[PDB]
Design an enzyme around this catalytic site. Structure first.
Site, mmCIF file in Angstrom:
data_model
loop_
_atom_site.group_PDB
_atom_site.id
_atom_site.type_symbol
_atom_site.label_atom_id
_atom_site.label_comp_id
_atom_site.label_asym_id
_atom_site.label_seq_id
_atom_site.Cartn_x
_atom_site.Cartn_y
_atom_site.Cartn_z
ATOM 1 N N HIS A 112 36.732 35.920 39.473
ATOM 2 C CA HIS A 112 36.955 34.938 38.402
ATOM 3 C C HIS A 112 38.387 34.405 38.353
ATOM 4 O O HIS A 112 38.623 33.337 37.790
ATOM 5 C CB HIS A 112 36.452 35.439 37.033
ATOM 6 N N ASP B 106 32.082 40.268 40.579
ATOM 7 C CA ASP B 106 33.430 39.810 40.251
ATOM 8 C C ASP B 106 34.449 40.537 41.123
ATOM 9 O O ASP B 106 35.181 41.413 40.663
ATOM 10 C CB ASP B 106 33.724 39.955 38.744
ATOM 11 N N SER C 57 43.281 40.994 34.474
ATOM 12 C CA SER C 57 42.143 40.666 35.338
ATOM 13 C C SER C 57 42.523 40.659 36.812
ATOM 14 O O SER C 57 43.561 40.107 37.179
ATOM 15 C CB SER C 57 41.548 39.321 34.946
ATOM 16 N N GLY C 58 41.706 41.319 37.626
ATOM 17 C CA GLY C 58 41.951 41.445 39.056
ATOM 18 C C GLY C 58 42.718 42.699 39.420
ATOM 19 O O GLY C 58 42.668 43.144 40.568
ATOM 20 N N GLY D 102 44.898 38.575 31.459
ATOM 21 C CA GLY D 102 46.092 38.621 32.296
ATOM 22 C C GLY D 102 46.129 39.827 33.215
ATOM 23 O O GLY D 102 46.817 39.800 34.241
HETATM 24 C C1 LIG Z 1 28.912 37.409 24.648
HETATM 25 C C2 LIG Z 1 29.815 36.830 25.725
HETATM 26 C C3 LIG Z 1 29.973 37.828 26.871
HETATM 27 O O1 LIG Z 1 30.774 37.254 27.918
HETATM 28 C C4 LIG Z 1 32.058 37.052 27.519
HETATM 29 S S1 LIG Z 1 33.105 38.215 26.871
HETATM 30 C C5 LIG Z 1 34.409 37.164 26.660
HETATM 31 C C6 LIG Z 1 35.748 37.541 26.038
HETATM 32 O O2 LIG Z 1 35.782 37.937 24.873
HETATM 33 N N1 LIG Z 1 36.878 37.468 26.746
HETATM 34 C C7 LIG Z 1 38.220 37.767 26.248
HETATM 35 C C8 LIG Z 1 38.990 36.535 26.749
HETATM 36 C C9 LIG Z 1 38.223 36.063 28.005
HETATM 37 C C10 LIG Z 1 37.029 37.025 28.132
HETATM 38 C C11 LIG Z 1 37.430 38.250 28.987
HETATM 39 C C12 LIG Z 1 38.743 38.880 28.472
HETATM 40 C C13 LIG Z 1 39.036 40.216 29.177
HETATM 41 C C14 LIG Z 1 38.620 41.437 28.634
HETATM 42 C C15 LIG Z 1 38.906 42.635 29.297
HETATM 43 C C16 LIG Z 1 38.442 43.973 28.715
HETATM 44 N N2 LIG Z 1 39.272 44.331 27.557
HETATM 45 C C17 LIG Z 1 39.603 42.614 30.506
HETATM 46 C C18 LIG Z 1 40.024 41.398 31.047
HETATM 47 C C19 LIG Z 1 39.743 40.204 30.381
HETATM 48 F F1 LIG Z 1 40.142 39.029 30.907
HETATM 49 C C20 LIG Z 1 38.738 39.040 26.938
HETATM 50 C C21 LIG Z 1 34.023 35.881 27.053
HETATM 51 C C22 LIG Z 1 34.950 34.663 26.998
HETATM 52 C C23 LIG Z 1 32.712 35.823 27.544
HETATM 53 BR BR1 LIG Z 1 31.897 34.244 28.204
#
Ligand SMILES: CCCOc1sc(C(=O)N2[C@@H]3CC[C@H]2C[C@H](c2cc(CN)ccc2F)C3)c(C)c1Br
Ligand SMILES: CCCOc1sc(C(=O)N2[C@@H]3CC[C@H]2C[C@H](c2cc(CN)ccc2F)C3)c(C)c1Br
Ligand SMILES: CCCOc1sc(C(=O)N2[C@@H]3CC[C@H]2C[C@H](c2cc(CN)ccc2F)C3)c(C)c1Br
Ligand SMILES: CCCOc1sc(C(=O)N2[C@@H]3CC[C@H]2C[C@H](c2cc(CN)ccc2F)C3)c(C)c1Br
Lengths: 242, 242, 242, 242
Positions: free
Chosen positions: B44, B91, B194-195, B192
């Site tokens: 992603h 992912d 992520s990855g 941030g």
């Molecule tokens: C019900 C929707 C399930 O899929 C999700 S969870 C989700 C969410 O709440 N996120 C926040 C901001 C983007 C997405 C993933 C984010 C995130 C969470 C974590 C775990 N704490 C690790 C990395 C990370 F980028 C946290 C989103 C935008 C979506 Br689409």
């Protein structure tokens, strides 16, 4: 709604506005009246997480949002059990009104299509709502109900278009069988139109082909609007809706 | 990184920062050095949309983000073909560096776990990155590399937690087989991170259990952090990296 | 408008909305009809830098902003030559309409006060507009015209109040002679009400005491709303207005 | 700082960073060390409203902001009593450190100019700081100390330039005698550089000509940077600074 124009007062009597409680009863999603006591919408609008019924209201056909507000309470929120994200699928939900509505010529239900009804390209189809006019460009006040005629794209052609400029394998389905494709770079649904209806005139009668679900942005190249296929969830709808 | 503290200089030599060209070479995602010429990250971060390789750089282990920048170019981006969204799965992504890095005591590779490796529930593991400190709370300057001890939550237990306060059917899997859970309301990875890697010390050896993938917010009740299970994609990794 | 209520349809026929060309004809400031062909506003709304006449429109009394739009073009923009900032003073401007307006009981002019008229505390005074309801809190849709009864404060008392918790010397005037003070922590004008009228009922006749100019925030302790004193610029107004 | 480049480590030893408490000790304004225990800044940085001493820290010359932080406490904040707004004038303030700074080659005081020096056009002048690189364009990480050679403009010409494309009367003063002008459409100070020094090399000695005060945007046509004229407030500075 990207492109098109403001809808006339007589057109789309089934169109509804979904409202959330905050500083005002803010529009967050669209919907369609499918029965005097039932509203069909997208599951992502009211899920996948449990929502408070008191913080939700249904607004029937309105020419300009927030002006002639007559908010109706919700008795039940029924979200498809297979729903989690719009991309996975099952982006369909039902809202049961506290009391059935007084059906008029200006405000009445939309006819659901039969199980065998396939919507092929070339068919006259329209999408309506109070959503964004472009990517990151909200519908300006007095927030009129917009309409746009969208061209239907076959699922396999739409799936192929979604793979252009993407790493996703050609054999890996993006546009699923429970989904429908419509729109181009000039005509499309957008954020705020979600849950709203996609109607097609089949043999002199308007049938709701889709429910505004998702897409990669709004009116972007090779990215048509994706809708939840109504025919696919007919058995689930009829389980709750008489 | 939610909770924990600034990582000591000698810890996590495999941690990398992925940079995108804009007003400056900005951090968008974390990663891990698995081979002197290969970086493991989440799909992603660099997909599903095809990215421009000239607009991407890799930064090796850095105590403070942006301070001693030694930006490395990329020759290849390999995104898993089954990838579209983090919720669907797959992912995982690989980045081939233009030149192999000179392996040292301060900057070296992370060991990948064997094919059968299982991570028991309650087991202490570590997640690192330069991500957000809380929901809508960015990592403040001088942007130190953060670390946090996260407890492993078994897949079936974690899936049940994601169903708590959700309309999604108990029989419909949210936490998939190619996914792994870790963290609580006080300890978690965030936007941030992520990855980035999820490391578990097994028999005196650090093994990468997961890749920071997704989650419903950061350190929220009944919503632990979701990671891409490294063991599930070992064959795909070994096909490209020696 | 901070505090008060939605104005009745029969009240404030002089209230005007100033519109700027962008994605739509956006309200940026208030105003008052003082002559069938003249609108009185604040200089900061239309200056100090030269504005394009074609990018400006005048909207007459509206119960709900944007809903019953009939935009009127402007032929002349006259800004007081002494104006630079609202804090320095001379925050007054005149807008000449291309054509005069057909006066009715619902839409008519406001009477300017006599040359020697002073507005002491206790007088029944109201401020109107479609501005923010509090600090960083926008007027929610359908954007009703708001009113608030504001208590007048003497210039020397208001000036010394602006010095409370400030480094500015007591001998250095903050609230100048061309300014008028009105409002408190519950009753005030805010961002978006600027240029609008402050009307006082003197001997059964409504007189425009001030023009919404500035203040340190909205309804903040020891910081009442500052208005341009109309009586001070009467000679300047009458030079252009018959 | 608009235009120019990153300052060498040996240049501008008097430059200081003003910090405010919140999620981190954030830079809000610049300053200059004029005496081992005194810092010269702009009054708008620390006023006109009374600020809490505990929430303020002084950071001496740093090549990269936040990276090598050695925050110093403040004992006294002395803001000019004639100050209320930067446009009115007297935008000058003094900060007394709790303890005197251990002066070295890397960190030392700037020489104040004699009362007679007017700094005419053609003088080699430089403005330094960690402010915005353009309008709405923040200084990118690792936040290096920037410098720019700025052309000095005579007060009456700068005042007249500010009247170009403005309704303000040609006889109504914008740029006051306690102000100094410098910069163009490619070279200027910006938001964040405020309070910082404007130094001119006179007889082989760096003299602080001005304090970054205000301007209509950054590097905008006919709107050069406005600085507080140090010579004007020499008597006021000497009342507190030995
Ligand atoms: C019900 C929707 C399930 O899929 C999700 S969870 C989700 C969410 O709440 N996120 C926040 C901001 C983007 C997405 C993933 C984010 C995130 C969470 C974590 C775990 N704490 C690790 C990395 C990370 F980028 C946290 C989103 C935008 C979506 Br689409
Ligand atoms: C590659 C990721 C595919 O899944 C997508 S598309 C997509 C997206 O670009 N969206 C924008 C804003 C939210 C989400 C869906 C939006 C949208 C598009 C349409 C079709 N133009 C209709 C309604 C609607 F809300 C347009 C998001 C957030 C996600 Br996750
Ligand atoms: C140093 C303080 C004096 O000069 C001021 S007050 C002031 C302020 O706090 N304002 C907020 C937002 C812009 C400016 C004026 C705003 C305002 C206040 C009122 C009175 N409550 C009426 C109209 C109106 F626009 C309220 C600003 C930006 C400036 Br510069
Ligand atoms: C016509 C209004 C004159 O008074 C001004 S100029 C002006 C402005 O455009 N500014 C931008 C952002 C805040 C204010 C001053 C800013 C500024 C300019 C400079 C010189 N380019 C140096 C420091 C600095 F903070 C640039 C404001 C807010 C006000 Br009030």
């Amino acid at each position: 709604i990207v492109g098109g124009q403001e809808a006339p007062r007589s057109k789309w009597p089934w169109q509804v506005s979904l409202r959330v409680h905050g500083p005002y009863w803010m529009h967050f999603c669209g919907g369609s009246l499918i029965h005097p006591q039932w509203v069909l919408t997208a599951a992502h609008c009211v899920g996948p997480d449990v929502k408070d019924l008191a913080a939700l209201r249904v607004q029937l056909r309105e020419q300009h949002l927030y002006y002639q507000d007559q908010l109706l309470p919700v008795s039940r929120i029924i979200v498809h059990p297979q729903f989690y994200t719009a991309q996975i699928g099952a982006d369909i939900a039902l809202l049961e009104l506290e009391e059935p509505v007084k059906v008029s010529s200006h405000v009445h239900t939309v006819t659901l299509p039969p199980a065998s009804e396939t919507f092929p390209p070339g068919m006259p189809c329209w999408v309506t709502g109070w959503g964004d006019v472009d990517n990151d460009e909200r519908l300006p006040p007095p927030f009129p109900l917009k309409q746009v005629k969208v061209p239907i794209m076959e699922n396999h052609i739409c799936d192929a278009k979604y793979h252009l400029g993407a790493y996703t394998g050609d054999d890996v389905r993006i546009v699923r069988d429970d989904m429908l494709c419509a729109g181009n770079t000039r005509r499309d649904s957008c954020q705020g139109d979600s849950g709203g209806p996609l109607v097609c005139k089949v043999n002199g009668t308007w049938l709701q082909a889709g429910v505004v679900s998702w897409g990669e942005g709004c009116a972007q190249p090779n990215r048509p609007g994706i809708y939840t296929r109504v025919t696919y969830y007919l058995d689930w709808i009829h389980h709750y809706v008489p």
